[PDB]
Structure 1
């Protein structure tokens, strides 16, 4: 895992995905912090969101554990920062990279998957009243991430 982790670290330093960064927490190469600037096509625009990344012993053959640290209002992310996203579980492959995971999360922020929610009330509002949904998502961004 360590040589692979060093390779990714150097690639993410040379050429990270747009609006994102990632690197080790202190001396520990297996625990990273990442940032996502709120995508311009989302109600998170203008905010900076911190995430935590923990690599398992058998990386890259098992997926990284990725969670939000910054609070966020979204049907697929709960109050513990857990993320419901296919490539972080059933759809992981060793061909994938942290760079690709960050790109996927950015996409999810722009377009939620309301039919596979972690937060039923937020999913109900997203489906029945999008105006109310985007308003509340912006309000949380402004209070916590800006």
Structure 2
């Protein structure tokens, strides 16, 4: 019926950050400030407290392809992390991760970053050993 196309959906996501809205714990913008297609995005997750992620930040690349948001983006950590849904040699978030596996058009990059941060904060994950800050995949 009434579908906002890819490019204007991406503009909506961009302008939400530019207006100061969004969660405190993660953020995202363009990886290339002059990418008119707005394919490659860059995200930041603040590590959850009381965990081996505390006071750490994680940088990620998010690739919003031509069928986004009907299809999920592709997500690759830049910052090295020990997290079961993150492939340990490529940093790619595995497609069986629930947000991607069950991706719905309503989901945004915000949804995805918040779900990743929640995954970091589970009892089983918060105690994993982490690599040195500054290491990248």
The answer to whether TM tops 0.5 is yes
The structure number with the bigger radius of gyration is 1
Give the alignment's TM-score, normalised by structure 1. 0.74
8 Å contact 1:38–1:44 — kept in the other structure? Answer: yes
Gaps of 5+ in 2: 1-5
Shift of 1:135: 6.3
RMSD: 2.2
Distance 2:113 2:63 in 1: 14
Find runs of 4+ consecutive structure 1 residues off by over 3 angstroms.
141-145
1:83 and 2:93 correspond: yes
Q: 2:112 aligns with which of 85, 101, 107?
A: 101
Match in the other structure for 1:57: 66
1:2 and 2:7 correspond: yes
Greater helix share, 1 or 2? 1
Shift of 1:32: 0.6
Gaps of 5+ in 1: 115-125, 127-132
Q: How many residues align?
A: 124
Give the alignment's TM-score, normalised by structure 2. 0.79
Relative to structure 1, the CA distance from residue 136 to residue 143 in structure 2 (aligned partners, 3 Å threshold; closer, same or farther) is: farther
Q: Does 56-65 or 14-23 show the bigger shift?
A: 14-23
Relative to structure 1, the CA distance from residue 65 to residue 18 in structure 2 (aligned partners, 3 Å threshold; closer, same or farther) is: same
